[model samples]
Target: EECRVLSIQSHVIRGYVGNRAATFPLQVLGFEIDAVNSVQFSNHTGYAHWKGQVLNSDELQELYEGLRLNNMNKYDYVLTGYTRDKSFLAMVVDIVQELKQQNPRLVYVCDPVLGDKGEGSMYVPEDLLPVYKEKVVPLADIITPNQFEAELLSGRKIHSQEEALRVMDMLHSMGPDTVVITSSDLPSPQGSNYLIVLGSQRRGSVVMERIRMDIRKVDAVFVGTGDLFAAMLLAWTHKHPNNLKVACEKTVSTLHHVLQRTIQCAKAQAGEGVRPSPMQLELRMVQSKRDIEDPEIVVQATVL
Candidate 1:
């Protein structure tokens, strides 16, 4: 049977690479996408003003009910990313539970897209973090959080790979069996740029892997690269079954390829402010099949 995945998020048409950005590759990977928007934006963050109305929890709940009535529970996976309020988060948690009940073997990836790493500003309502902490994470089978979201989930300030492992476990205990922290710039002898994807178990197991890259290049890779990461992960996890590390490696390889291509494009067209615009992400290479099949899963205190 052909596998299917459902994505629930703010379906902004064109803006920062949020939901629309994530939808592209998933379709390319062959999964039928069922997206429900939480909000519609006037423009992305780069633009001065983002005027939009949040889709109330009631509306979101109604949509979920409609999906159930339509018998959309046959999905192999469900992914949620970027909500703007506590009520919405609560609704998402409830929906996840509902879906899990219907499909016990379903893979759910929750991207707590709270904010970025530079400044720990809360993009979503402050109260919403707790909803993510107690409700959503506990239900999520896998979670994709950036460095800051991981810290918030872990409640620890991790500065090293060892600390990252501890933090990943900290998040796993909350409920998510797999944790993928997308962006990290930990200071190292060589540099402070790398990607860490960690996994936990429903049966008390833990695994961590690091993919290193040049810091100078990463800063300008592209916006919504993390969104791309989560989308790729959804594809790989379905294809690879319960092999969490395999999914992570596939995601990392796909991300590296896209970022490299974006960087080269920017360099060729230099004086473009060191990076491509968010919309340019639409052109990235989407690798649905695993690119690096036998990638070395380096588990250690130090990440290369």
Candidate 2:
């Protein structure tokens, strides 16, 4: 069965990590989305030669006005991935607020697309961060940020799961009831990466799947996992909001399957190096099974 979704965000022509990974996952999982490209691009940062264009913030409003004039309700959920400018981010927030008020049940998931895991280190303009903090986060029902972005928003560095709790609390208090911290990797004798979920109430978890930093030599410096990460959250949330932890666990498991597949692909096609592409095409889809039903995958994580 196909579910209707309105992707009201950036669209990269050559397919960005955020756009390609995010869009295909939802479509494969059975969604029909009218994707509005807030920004169009030839490729992502990983590629040295790429070209693109950003749609004006006012243009987005014009689209909204057309929708209003036509009395169209062609979407179930609103998914926003990446924005180019401060004006665009502000426009998105206002649009999100208006959508929620009018529809009453629209799901707004803001990816807060500001660099991650030291990759996006100080890349965004300083003025833009404040706008996201003041305008965007407050409007979203579920906010997705990697550990780096999480630290930026909460004004707290999450060195440990314990520290993450404080940061999550600060984010929740600000506006978002649910905060999903994507791509949390910590350094140790052996490399390890963890994902943290903190929201409404003091519940949280730190789950790590083995990471091979050696592969960084094989994969490009930057990629588009954040896009897929947000997509999975939005999809699972629709059917399993009451059990967010479980939904998160399922997402992690699926992500692992896909990640493993990518590793194999990289290994298979050596010498010429490969991009860290989304693995939806090769990995198996996760079912709503009991083992994956454990909320603890998200609620109980330990650094090993």
Candidate 3:
């Protein structure tokens, strides 16, 4: 009755992202959380200045080694997020591999936070990519990647819905039975105001199910959204295994409610003419507790 998750994520003293973003939602859904902060900061990097300590590879292993000595290392799922160090990422892969051996059914949910490439270059050191590509991806059972990260992982570009589908397939070949391209800039048939998210699940290396959903675009960019997404998927998929349609419908709809609630409060405080500061835009994680527990299915997915 108790499912445990080993969440390795970033953390900020204030605001939500990584462990702060993920732990609350999963705990609300009744999953026990073991959160390891990969990076601890005063606040998210979105602020004018942020200060924190990053856990290196050996430190990460030390923590895991401590867990092992106590015989408390077993977990049903492992969720991971941003990493600045290549060796840290590789160490994560090694940990997941060991966890899998401990519990063969253990799911590794990875929100591969390969940094922004808006400048046509990775903002997180370039070396992290190869480790993720060569090692991390293969160990992941489920992955939540944005369009940029997806392109980087698959080595394929997406221009249309068909191309996105092809890209998901390529990623499946690399590893991860279930892949969700969290958000893409592609035009959604639903409307110009919506963003396309694609998901694919492969069972037994054969029968495959692909889906497409449109998430109404919010005017403001919010941090930690992806962390929450991966956390929710871990909850929902556990609730409805092999049924990505229902799981994602609940997952995305929960986001629709949580984020919609966040932006409305954020905009109201920032006023009509002013942009909200990071403090003003903090995710309404506490406010959306009910939605996270039992979200109204506001968004639906189309089986492709």
Candidate 4:
């Protein structure tokens, strides 16, 4: 009756992105985690300098098969993040299919990490889009796509709440019963000062709003926010399967506390005239461990 998870994603040695960002949070929430590094990096790609190696499909499959042979294949959930290689993604699909067969109740949480809005361009390769739509999206039980990814996957422009709902419906038809648009730039009647996160499930839809922070002072937005968010989400969903609105609320609340702690630590370390390095800006996840285990923020998710 213990919760076990198979997590596949990038791994950074010195930062809090990928599995480094995910594993600890899940552990804090009482889930046994088995992590697979799709790519190993000295630091996140956002840095001016970084070094590491990516694992090929054969190498990844070898590890999975070893787990199976050892009879360690039974899992309560499978979670994945950014994957740049098509072949590797294909192998993930195969592994997911195998696991689902072994345990039909297994939940696969896919954070389709294609890219985000930036200078009117996509960060991920163009070919990766179809693979997600045609292959990955269909197999996932829950998908946490950001606003841009939702648009690309659903083939619908999301400028308003109505359009966002239409896109969520289109995606539901494709496969995932639970869909969450993590961040949105869609027009808000509340105006430009506020931000919204949208969640949809079989029961109903919910929209959670918050005050947008001004990060212009920082040289870069902190990496690993999505990874941490997704990890917390998977844990919370497993804990509160019946009410997705509460799941979203807890996920967002915990993230807010962690990030707030991270920012404060980074600024204090910078100390007046010094600008913080990207590594210095890495999430203070370890330092915020207690908050992760017991988040105190009270956020309300408005059911729509």
Candidate 5:
């Protein structure tokens, strides 16, 4: 089968985030891509100053319609991220439903980008939360939610591994054959210094550990990491259909390599005396294409 994907996300004229972060990795892995940018921006919102225009619902609908008319809607996969408006999000769901009709085997991966748990507050509008929980989640074949998003979607607080399992159960009951919890801070009784990512499917569950990066500094956290991770997960899952453990392991391995390169390049630009601007801290994705194609690191996924 031909590996084709439709990626719907934000785009920036400069720096990596949204489609800018996702497109290259998928292309390097040899997936044919049809990309739609929800917003066109000079840079991501993390910057103090930025400019962009969002594509409204009607325009998005027309674009999808154009593809459908040309018989280009039969995609093997659909990946969605960071749609902020209600109408725009609705249009994306409609497009997903329509594409599923064209190809029953279509896999939909929803990166429920509602907001993150930062400073104990939600970054997205409160109204968008209900839409994601009620309308969007049920339609997804796979969902990649961070710990905060998992809690938001499941309406449960997760503090430990036991609660994490229950949260996964609640998410599965809603829909989504597979659930991957990223940036999870849930306690591991085994006590490792590494940060944990949990993956749960009907077959079983797996826990992956990555060497914890010092994200204490706000500037140290790179924008669009989630977007990149979701894209890699989509490609890796397609490669290893039944074993999510292998898919996650490969995904994290690649991400580790990319982050290492990004950090090194950022430090080089700082060059001892200057402070690193957020834009300067942008991922060196273009320079790290080889790492994406063939990750040098080997991170293991342990079955739980």
Candidate 6:
């Protein structure tokens, strides 16, 4: 049976991010994807001068309306990221509810794109926070939030590993059975050069197990990696529903391959010293088709 996914996110004609980043990877992993772009842009916002049309709440609802009328709104999973409007986000929640009502088994995987700590500020409006807290987070089955975004969602800061776990546990109360703090800047005893990823899943009535994995830092940045992570995670979880460890292992390892491919390709295009322009940084997603389809899970998870 083909697993159908409805991915709602941004789109770029020139590069991979959000839908563009997620569609190819999810398709390669044997999932049927229908990507509804929340924004249509010539290029990612990272570019010097970029332009796009942002879809508002009414527009979003109209699109869903068409699907509903045709009986094509059904989906096995719903994936989302980087919502830019308050009413639009609410509309998304409404659609997700309708989809869930049609089929109780549909899973909602969300990447709360609130501000990250790297920039030390939020790129999204503060008004969106309350909506996410009051409505959005409660409906999610799986959520991927970076350290700062987790702090925002859980209403608690993470200074220690235990603190992060507490935050993850706190998130589950709002609703998601699984939560992955995608990346954190907290110091690692393993070393400073490595970044940490934490994932917690609900089992019975308490935390089943927590996975802590350290990834060696890549010197350069790549856009859309987060979207790729969510897509791979959705695919992997469908395969190993009972084991977060294996799912995380496969998702993170494939991510590692994608990142390295982007780096090597970016560097070669930049001739090694130009520091890789944003154009050169577009994820080598096409080149990484094989790795995405079948990744060797080299990244191990330590049960915390």
The most accurate candidate by lDDT is 6
User: In candidate 2, which residue ranges exceed 4 Å CA deviation?
Assistant: 1-3, 73-75, 117-120, 185-222, 272-304
| Local distance difference test, each candidate | 0.68, 0.62, 0.89, 0.84, 0.83, 0.91
Per-residue lDDT tens digits for candidate 4, residues 1-304, read 6899999999999889999999999998899999999989999988999999999999999999899999889998999998888899999999999999999999999999887773235767888899899999999988999889999998888887778878888888898878888887765455565567788876347532222221112234889988988899898888888778788888888887877787777778887767777767889888888888888856777777
Q: Where is the poorest 10-residue window by lDDT in model 2?
A: 209-218
Q: Write the per-residue lDDT of candidate 6 for residues 1-304, one digit (tens) a residue.
A: 8899999999899999999999998888888899899999999988898988988889889999999999998899999999879989999999999999998999999999998875469979999999898899999999999999999988887888889999998999899999999999877777879888999988645548789998888787789989999988999988999889999999999999988888888888898577999999999899999998889878889988
TM-score: model 6 vs. ground truth: 0.97
> How accurate locally is residue 287 in candidate 3, as Cα lDDT from 0 to 100?
96
Positional deviation of 297 in candidate 5, in angstroms?
3.5
lDDT order, best first, reads 6, 3, 4, 5, 1, 2
Candidate 2 local lDDT, 1-304, one digit each (tens): 4566667665555543655566766766667766777776776655557677878889988988788688765456788876757787787777777777777667677888777654447556778789888888877777878778888887777786567666767887787666766656544333333233443322248332211111111133325555666777787766676656555655665455555555565556553454434322222223322222332242322321
* Worst ten in a row by lDDT for model 4: 209-218
Off by over 4 Å in 3: 117-121
Order of candidate numbers by TM-score, starting with the best:
6, 3, 4, 5, 1, 2
Task: For model 6, state the Cα shift of residue 230 in Å.
Answer: 0.9
lDDT of 1 by residue, 1-304 (tens): 6767777776554543667667767776777877777777765665445676678989989887887898966777888887777777787778878888888988888888887655677777778788888888888887888778899877898787678767877887887777766666565454445444444434335444433332323664365666667877778777875666566666666666666666666566655555545555443443322333332333332232
Tens-place lDDT per residue, model 3, 201-239, is 998457988888988987888888888899999999999
- Angstrom error at residue 86, model 2: 0.8
For residues 1-304, write the lDDT of model 5, one tens digit per residue: 5689999999999999999999988998999987899999999888999998999999999999899889988999999998879898888889998888989988899999866663346766788888899888988988999888999999998887678878888998898888888777754544544556788876436532222221211236788889999999898888888778778877887877778787777778887766677877898898888888877646667777
RMSD of each: 4.4, 6.5, 1.5, 3.5, 3.5, 1.4
How much is 86 displaced in model 5, in angstroms?
0.6
Q: Give me the runs in candidate 5 sitting further than 4 Å from their true place.
A: 188-193, 203-219, 271-275
TM-score of each: 0.80, 0.77, 0.96, 0.92, 0.91, 0.97
On TM-score, the leading prediction is 6
